[PDB]
């Protein structure tokens, strides 16, 4: 009945840290799918087990809007069964990754000349995340056996950097705002139709 | 957790780390080399500051993983390259006492003047004022004044600040394990554990020499001829016999012999290929100097310049208020972003630059995907070599034809192509002998084979014996000959200009052999050859990753540096010099002296 939030995710004036991704549940609404185009430089929209040709004749139960900004190289990690920092630390699709990613440059915003460090993502973990994980967690990275004792030192790293963007950076490092939609299919009514 | 995965995610902190901080002291250089203001200065030293304390920070961080313990050959070259970075080898005292006197003799040659003898009130630095008496001035007196008294008041200065530099270098060089400072800078050719293409210290000397012997036939036959050419204006100055004069060369050094070319041209009758005022003719700007230049690398297949270059670089003099440093320089400032800055003029010389410094960008464009400390050549001349091969096939009369600058009506007859040669010989070839021997040189000075009192004795033994040039003036020991040039006196390995010249031909050699060219080397455009850029980009990409060894087989098909591809583009000129040299000596003697 009510129009779908896909504005509030898209036009966020500041996106998530891809770390630290924001998920939006998309639920009880018309979701129009031929508004998601910002006019932006490098606009990228690829689906995956649905259709972006008329996405808009379709029922989903859920629909998981997740947002973080990444650099012009990464994009390529928001993918399934894709490997990199961002996809093993920050932001893992599944191999049956039913959705679409949707990503754009966004340097106009996210870059500064001093450097924009609000976003970040993590470059150290234990091990990769499992899809759709998140990990905010601030906790001092251990690389050698001796102890980190919660602060940054020799093989003791804060597993998060920051990309530091700069208008001048070139196209594969300049921010580029993500969101992925993520469609779920349960034995619920399914309350996100909408042409 | 072994130690190669503690180097492995050190290396990857400092990767992003130094990226971040390399950038901002690239920008920071470049806003100060495009607009030099006070503060544009300060910001770069502080972002200067901030990345070197960065690096002397990793790089004793780095040292805490000691090296025989990684396996992987990659990881070891970056955790060696940031250990071999590493400052804190020679006691604070003596690294301050270094630092010290390498900015003292910085500055000396920076800052050196000499002033009229007759009238003492006018001073001449040595850019422009020396540097336009010895590249411009056929006068002997003026050529001789200027010259010695660069060396008798800015290189007697160095000498005592260069006994020292010697010294703590060498100090530095065997608390890193390396017998001298000479051997310290032929590491930058080592390769180990990767076999069938290891290549030693010491084997670099070896192969220079080896390869230089195969040079001489070549130079003498030049060092003749233009010994016969000057002899003709300067009867009463040169023996037939004899080594060329120094102040005599073109320069403050003979590094080059390019501005003897109005002396000794072969047919000064026919006019030399001068596309400049073919492109103000077609109202050619910097903008379409650099399009013409990216065209040419994406008929090679490489890459066009990306959206940040054509934005961010400086193509022209900003004139006006705003002052820049005009030193054509290809800028890898890391994430992405590649500029170039180049006050660039509507003129065949910057026409050529422009292909040669967008050769730089395309090598850093290529290897921008490797590790941040893999980012470079494959060696000391790899980056330079890519820059000249450019020039050699955008000045081709092939390449000028095909692009507007020289009208079809236009042939080259033989005698217009030993003009050319010669005049590449002047610059290309008498270099050589002259980078070998200052090398030689300071390799010798660095081992301890000459003592401080006899070095500008063997300076001068070997400038006659090696370049066939003699000091117009008696030196002694209080002088620095050697330091009276910016690479000894600015602590610069020299070796890299001798084997870029190999490699440049080599390089150009195997691409023309790419591309198909028929007919000599000297004439060949590799243009419109994807072939060509394609076996180019397989060592460009490679960077530092690869030993240099294979970067050069990936290109010719040969392990080592061959001097072969160079005499194959000077074999027109170098049989037109043994005809022209059939009733003229060929060699020198080394007794012979202006001064009697
Ligand atoms: C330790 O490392 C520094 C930094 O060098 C930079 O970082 C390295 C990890 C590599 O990636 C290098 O490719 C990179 O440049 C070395 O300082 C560098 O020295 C060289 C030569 O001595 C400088 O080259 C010249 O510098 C002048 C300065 O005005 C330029 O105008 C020239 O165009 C030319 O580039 C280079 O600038 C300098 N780096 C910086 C940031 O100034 C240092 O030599 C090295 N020390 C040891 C012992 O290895
Ligand atoms: C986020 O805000 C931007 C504004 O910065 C919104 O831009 C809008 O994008 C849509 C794309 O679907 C545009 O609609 C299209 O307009 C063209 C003509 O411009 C028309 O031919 C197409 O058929 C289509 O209707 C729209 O004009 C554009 N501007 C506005 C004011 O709506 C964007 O919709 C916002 N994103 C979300 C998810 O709400
Ligand atoms: C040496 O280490 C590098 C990495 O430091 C190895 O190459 C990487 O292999 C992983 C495994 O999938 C990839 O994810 C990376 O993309 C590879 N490249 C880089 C730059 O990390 C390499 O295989 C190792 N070689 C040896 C002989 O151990
Ligand atoms: C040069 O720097 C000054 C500050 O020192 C600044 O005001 C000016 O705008 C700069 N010029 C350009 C062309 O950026
Ligand atoms: C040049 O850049 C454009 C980007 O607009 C790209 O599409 C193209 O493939 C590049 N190369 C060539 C040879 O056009
Ligand atoms: C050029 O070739 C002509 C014959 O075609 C010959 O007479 C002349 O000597 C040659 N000149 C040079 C410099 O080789
Ligand atoms: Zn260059």
């Given at each position: ?72 190289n ?96 070139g196209?594969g ?23 | ?14 990767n992003?780390?130094?990226e ?52 992987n050959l990659t990881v070891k070259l970056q955790?060696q390259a940031?250990?071999q ?100 800078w032929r590491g930058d050719y080592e390769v180990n554990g990767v076999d069938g293409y290891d290549y030693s210290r010491?084997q670099l000397?070896?192969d220079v020499?080896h390869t ?81 230049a990216e065209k040419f690398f994406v008929s090679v297949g490489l890459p066009n310049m990306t959206?940040?270059f ?18 054509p320089t290809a800028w890898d400032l890391g994430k992405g972003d590649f500029r170039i ?11 050529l630059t422009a292909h040669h410094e967008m050769g730089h960008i395309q090598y850093d464009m290529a290897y921008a995907a490797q590790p941040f400390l893999l980012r470079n050549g494959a060696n000391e001349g790899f980056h330079e070599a890519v820059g000249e091969i450019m020039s050699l096939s955008a000045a081709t009369?092939?390449h ?28 290309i070839?008498?270099?050589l002998?002259?980078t ?57 390995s020299?070796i890299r200009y001798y084997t870029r010249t190999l490699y440049q031909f080599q390089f150009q050699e195997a691409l023309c052999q790419a591309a198909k060219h028929?007919?000599?080397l000297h004439?060949c455009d590799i243009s419109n050859s994807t072939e060509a850029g394609q076996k180019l980009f397989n060592m460009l990409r490679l960077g530092k990753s690869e030993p240099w060894t294979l970067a050069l087989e990936n290109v010719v098909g040969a392990k080592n540096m061959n001097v072969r591809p160079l005499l194959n583009y ?27």
């Amino acid at each position: 009945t009510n129009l779908c939030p896909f504005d509030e995710v898209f036009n966020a004036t500041r996106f998530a840290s891809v770390y630290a991704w924001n998920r939006k549940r998309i639920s009880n609404c018309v979701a129009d799918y031929s508004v998601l185009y910002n006019f932006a430089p490098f606009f990228t929209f690829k689906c995956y087990g649905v259709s972006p040709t008329k996405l808009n004749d379709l029922c989903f139960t859920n629909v998981y809007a997740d947002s973080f900004v990444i650099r012009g190289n990464e994009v390529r990690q928001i993918a399934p069964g894709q490997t990199g920092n961002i996809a093993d630390y920050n932001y893992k699709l599944p191999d049956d990754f039913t959705g679409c990613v949707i990503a754009w440059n966004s340097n106009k915003l996210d870059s500064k000349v001093s450097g924009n460090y609000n976003y970040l993502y993590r470059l150290f973990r234990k091990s990769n995340l499992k899809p759709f994980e998140r990990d905010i967690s601030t906790e001092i990275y251990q690389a050698g056996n001796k102890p980190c004792n919660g602060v940054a030192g020799f093989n003791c790293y804060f597993p998060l950097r920051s990309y530091g963007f700069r208008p001048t950076y070139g196209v594969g490092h300049q921010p580029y705002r993500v969101v992925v939609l993520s469609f779920e299919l349960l034995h619920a009514p399914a309350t996100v139709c909408g042409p | 957790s072994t130690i190669e995965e503690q180097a492995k995610t050190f290396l990857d902190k400092f990767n992003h780390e130094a990226e971040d901080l390399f950038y901002q002291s690239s920008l920071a250089s470049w806003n100060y080399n495009t607009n030099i203001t006070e503060e544009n200065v300060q910001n770069m030293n502080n972002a200067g500051d901030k990345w070197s304390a960065f690096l002397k920070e990793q790089s004793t961080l780095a040292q805490m993983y000691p090296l025989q313990e990684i396996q992987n050959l990659t990881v070891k070259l970056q955790l060696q390259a940031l250990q071999q970075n590493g400052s804190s080898v020679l006691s604070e005292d003596k690294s301050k006492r270094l630092n010290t006197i390498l900015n003292t003799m910085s500055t000396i040659y920076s800052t050196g003047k000499v002033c009229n003898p007759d009238n003492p009130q006018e001073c001449l630095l040595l850019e422009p004022g020396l540097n336009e008496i010895m590249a411009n001035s056929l006068d002997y007196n003026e050529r001789l004044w200027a010259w010695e008294s660069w060396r008798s008041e800015v290189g007697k200065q160095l000498r005592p600040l260069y006994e020292e530099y010697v010294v703590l270098k060498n100090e530095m060089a065997r608390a890193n394990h390396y017998e001298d400072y000479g051997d310290y800078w032929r590491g930058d050719y080592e390769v180990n554990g990767v076999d069938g293409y290891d290549y030693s210290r010491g084997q670099l000397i070896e192969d220079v020499e080896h390869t230089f012997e195969e040079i001489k036939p070549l130079y003498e036959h030049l060092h003749a001829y233009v010994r016969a050419k000057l002899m003709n204006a300067y009867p009463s100055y040169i023996s037939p016999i004899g080594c060329l004069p120094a102040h005599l060369l073109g320069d403050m050094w003979g590094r080059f012999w390019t501005n003897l070319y109005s002396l000794t041209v072969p047919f000064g009758q026919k006019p030399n290929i001068d596309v400049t005022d073919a492109m103000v003719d077609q109202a050619w700007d910097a903008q379409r100097i650099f399009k013409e230049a990216e065209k040419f690398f994406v008929s090679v297949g490489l890459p066009n310049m990306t959206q940040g270059f054509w934005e961010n670089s400086m193509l022209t003099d900003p004139g006006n208020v705003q002052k820049a440093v005009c030193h054509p320089t290809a800028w890898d400032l890391g994430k992405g972003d590649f500029r170039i800055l180049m006050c660039t003029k509507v003129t065949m010389d910057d026409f050529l630059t422009a292909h040669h410094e967008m050769g730089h960008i395309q090598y850093d464009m290529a290897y921008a995907a490797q590790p941040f400390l893999l980012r470079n050549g494959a060696n000391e001349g790899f980056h330079e070599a890519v820059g000249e091969i450019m020039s050699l096939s955008a000045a081709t009369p092939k390449h000028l034809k095909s692009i507007g600058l020289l009208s079809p009506d236009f042939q080259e007859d033989n005698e217009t192509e030993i003009n050319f040669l010669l005049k590449q010989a002047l610059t290309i070839v008498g270099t050589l002998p002259f980078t070998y021997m200052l090398e030689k040189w300071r390799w010798m000075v660095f081992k301890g084979e000459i003592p401080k009192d006899q070095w500008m004795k063997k300076w001068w033994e070997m400038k006659r014996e090696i370049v066939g040039v003699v000091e117009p003036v008696p030196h002694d020991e209080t002088y620095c000959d050697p330091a009276s040039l910016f690479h000894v006196s600015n602590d610069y390995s020299f070796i890299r200009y001798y084997t870029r010249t190999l490699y440049q031909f080599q390089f150009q050699e195997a691409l023309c052999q790419a591309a198909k060219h028929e007919g000599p080397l000297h004439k060949c455009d590799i243009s419109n050859s994807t072939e060509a850029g394609q076996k180019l980009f397989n060592m460009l990409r490679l960077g530092k990753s690869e030993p240099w060894t294979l970067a050069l087989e990936n290109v010719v098909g040969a392990k080592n540096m061959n001097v072969r591809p160079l005499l194959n583009y000077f074999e027109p000129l170098f049989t037109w010099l043994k005809d022209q040299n059939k009733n003229s000596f060929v060699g020198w003697s080394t007794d012979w002296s202006p001064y009697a």
